[PDB]
Amino acid sequence: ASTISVKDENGTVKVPKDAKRIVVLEYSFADALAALDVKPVGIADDGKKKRIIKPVREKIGDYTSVGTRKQPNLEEISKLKPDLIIADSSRHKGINKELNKIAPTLSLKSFDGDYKQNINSFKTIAKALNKEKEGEKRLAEHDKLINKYKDEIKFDRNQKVLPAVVAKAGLLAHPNYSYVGQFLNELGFKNALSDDVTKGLSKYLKGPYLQLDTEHLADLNPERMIIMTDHAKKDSAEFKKLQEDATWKKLNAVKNNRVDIVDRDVWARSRGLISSEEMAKELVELSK
Numbered sequence: 001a002s003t004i005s006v007k008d009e010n011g012t013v014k015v016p017k018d019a020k021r022i023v024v025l026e027y028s029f030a031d032a033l034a035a036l037d038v039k040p041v042g043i044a045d046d047g048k049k050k051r052i053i054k055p056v057r058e059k060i061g062d063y064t065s066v067g068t069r070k071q072p073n074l075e076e077i078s079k080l081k082p083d084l085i086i087a088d089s090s091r092h093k094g095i096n097k098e099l100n101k102i103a104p105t106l107s108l109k110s111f112d113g114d115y116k117q118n119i120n121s122f123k124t125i126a127k128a129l130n131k132e133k134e135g136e137k138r139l140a141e142h143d144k145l146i147n148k149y150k151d152e153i154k155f156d157r158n159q160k161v162l163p164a165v166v167a168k169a170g171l172l173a174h175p176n177y178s179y180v181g182q183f184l185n186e187l188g189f190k191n192a193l194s195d196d197v198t199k200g201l202s203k204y205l206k207g208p209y210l211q212l213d214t215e216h217l218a219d220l221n222p223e224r225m226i227i228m229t230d231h232a233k234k235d236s237a238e239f240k241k242l243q244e245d246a247t248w249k250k251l252n253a254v255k256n257n258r259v260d261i262v263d264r265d266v267w268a269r270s271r272g273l274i275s276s277e278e279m280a281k282e283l284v285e286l287s288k
């Protein structure tokens with residue numbers, strides 16, 4: 001037997017050539033596998049299978065939950081006897097050793113990665129599986145759709161945007177170095193957050209997700225906003241209190257009718273080729 005050496009975030013990992021059983025510890029690595037018609041046996045899916053977007057979910061089929069992304073359950077991982085574990089370079093720094101005792105571990109950008117880096121992690125997975133060819137063609141299909149949709153989005157690009165989650169209790173802004181933000185940058189948009197106001201702002205779980213006081217909100221006064229939510233009725237008790245707040249009402253985007261509410265699973269959690277493809281289709285349909 002032999003190996004394929006692959007550069008992960010730490011350094012060169014030795015992945016078995018025959019790698020058949022894969023545990024993945026972020027949704028985005030589950031999207032990468034699906035796009036190479038490879039199906040993992042384990043997913044850290046927060047116990048919530050529906051957080052795996054539709055085209056991925058049905059292309060993966062039936063798998064085993066290894067628990068939360070934040071705290072993957074090591075005995076369920078072990079029992080699955082994976083030939084390879086794809087872990088997040090941010091989320092799982094602390095279980096990296098204990099993952100390697102189970103199986104050779106590829107630590108990659110996901111949670112703290114912007115749009116390009118997540119795509120870089122996809123290429124790394126494809127090389128590790130020896131599917132470079134499929135990988136390039138899928139990306140070539142990807143680079144086409146995205147740019148196609150980019151040419152059809154009828155929003156004016158000069159109206160700066162703030163993408164945010166209203167966390168519980170929020171707000172969390174997604175800057176230019178978040179997945180959403182850069183993806184919007186790649187589509188032509190300018191983040192309302194300047195690459196200098198973000199200087200401070202505390203981070204959420206070490207990722208590019210930045211706590212904003214309602215007064216930071218008013219100061220930057222974005223011209224467009226994109227609020228990511230998990231509520232099917234796009235309601236949220238949390239968000240409705242923000243909409244009553246006098247200082248929210250005075251925002252430029254609120255007053256010029258340019259607030260779009262979208263699905264957080266799809267926009268923020270997924271971080272895959274398919275999910276960006278839905279994000280860009282949406283934005284064409286929202287542009288009208």
Ligand SMILES: O=C(O)C[C@@](O)(CC(=O)NCCC[C@@H](NC(=O)C[C@@](O)(CC(=O)O)C(=O)O)C(=O)O)C(=O)O
Nearest residue numbers: 046069070111165167168169170172204209264268269
């Ligand atoms: O999860 C992602 O990949 C990305 C992202 O964390 C990005 C984001 O803007 N985060 C704001 C969420 C703040 C919110 N916390 C949760 O809801 C729990 C959790 O975040 C846990 C986790 O992630 O381990 C979860 O997602 O289940 C709170 O209560 O204040 C996101 O959730 O959209």
Ligand SMILES: [Fe+3]
Nearest residue numbers: 069205268269
């Ligand atoms: Fe989260």
Ligand SMILES: [Zn+2]
Nearest residue numbers: 213215216217
């Ligand atoms: Zn402030």
Ligand SMILES: [Zn+2]
Nearest residue numbers: 215216218219
């Ligand atoms: Zn101020």
Ligand SMILES: [Zn+2]
Nearest residue numbers: 231233235236
């Ligand atoms: Zn609701």
Ligand SMILES: [Zn+2]
Nearest residue numbers: 231236237238
């Ligand atoms: Zn809620």
